Amino acid sequence: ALWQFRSMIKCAIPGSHPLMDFNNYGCYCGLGGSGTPVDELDRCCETHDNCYRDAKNLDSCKFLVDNPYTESYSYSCSNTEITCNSKNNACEAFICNCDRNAAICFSKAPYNKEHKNLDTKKYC
Amino acid sequence: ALWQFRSMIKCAIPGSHPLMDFNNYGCYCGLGGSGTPVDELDRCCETHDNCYRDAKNLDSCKFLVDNPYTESYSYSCSNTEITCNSKNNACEAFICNCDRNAAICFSKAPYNKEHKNLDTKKYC
Ligand SMILES: CCCCCCCCCCCCCCCCOC[C@H](COCC(F)(F)F)OP(=O)(O)OC
Ligand SMILES: [Ca+2]
Ligand SMILES: [Ca+2]
Mapped to the 3 state alphabet, what secondary structure does chain A carry?
A: CHHHHHHHHHHHCCCCCHHHHHCCECCCECCCCCCCCCCHHHHHHHHHHHHHHHHHHCHHHCCCCCCHHHCCCCEEEECCEEEECCCCCHHHHHHHHHHHHHHHHHCCCCCCHHHECCCHHHHC
A residues 81-120 lying closer than 8 A (beta carbon) to B: 117, 119-120
What does this entry list as its resolution, in Å? 2.0
- C-alpha to C-alpha distance for A111 and A6, rounded to whole angstroms: 17
Ligand 1 centroid to Cα of residue A75, in Å, is 19
Following CA atoms B72, B74, B78, B82 in sequence, which dihedral angle do they give, to the nearest 10 degrees?
-60
The CA-based diameter of chain B, rounded to the nearest angstrom, is 45
DSSP B114: G
Per-domain boundaries in chain B: 1-124
Report CA dihedral (B60, B65, B69, B71) to the nearest 10 degrees. -60
Contact between A5 and A49 under an 8 Å Cβ cutoff? The reply is no
Residue A32 annotated as binding?
yes
Query: Smallest Cα–Cα separation from A6: which of B96, B18, B10?
Result: B18
Note if B99 is an active site residue: yes
Q: Which fold has domain A1-124?
A: Phospholipase A2 (1.20.90)
CA dist., res. A100 & res. A104, Å (int): 7
- CA Rg, chain B, in Å? 14
3-state secondary structure of B116: strand
Residue A11 CA to residue B123 CA, distance in Å, equals 35
Give how far A108 is from chain B: nearest CA, Å: 22
Task: State yes or no: is A17 an active-site residue.
Answer: no
The answer to whether A69 touches A5, Cβ cutoff 8 Å, is: yes
Closest CA of chain A from B18, distance in Å: 8
Give Cβ neighbours of residue B59 (< 8 Å, ≥ 6 apart).
Answer: none
Angle at B31 between CA B70 and CA B44, to 5 degrees: 90
Interhelix angle A90-106/A2-12, nearest 10 degrees? 40
Sign, CA torsion A83/A87/A90/A95: negative
Give the H or E element holding residue B7.
Answer: helix B2-12
User: CA-CA distances (angstroms) from residue B79 to B8, B12, B84?
Assistant: 12, 8, 14
CA-nearest of B93, B5, B13 to B49 is: B5
Residue A112's identity, in one-letter code, is: N
Q: Which residue of B has its CA nearest to A117?
A: B70
How far apart (Å, rounded) are the C-alpha atoms in residues B124 and B120? 5
Do residues A36 and A26 touch, judged by C-beta distance below 8 A?
no
CB-based contact, B121 to chain A, within 8 Å: yes
B31 pocket-lining for ligand 1 (C-beta < 6 Å): yes
Spatial distance between the Cα atoms of A20 and A18, rounded to a whole number of angstroms: 5
Q: What is the dihedral of CA B49, A25, A84, A72, to 10 degrees?
A: 10
Catalytic residue among A42, A54, A59, A99: A99
**Number of residues assigned to chain B:** 124
Which residue of A7, A8, A17, A19 is the best one to mutate when testing the B interface, meaning the one whose CB has the most B CBs within 10 A? A19
- B35 close to ligand 1 (CB < 6 Angstrom): no
Report how this structure was experimentally obtained: X-ray
Distance CA A30, CA A120 (A): 11
CA B8 to chain centre: 9
φ and ψ at residue A81, rounded to 5 degrees: -110, 125
Q: Find out whether the beta carbon of B6 lies less than 6 Å from any atom of ligand 1.
A: yes
Q: Are A26 and A20 in contact (CB under 8 A)?
A: no
Tell me the C-alpha to C-alpha distance, in Å, between residue B93 and each of A20, B73, B75: 19, 7, 9
Q: At what angle do helices A90-106 and A40-57 cross, to 10 degrees?
A: 180
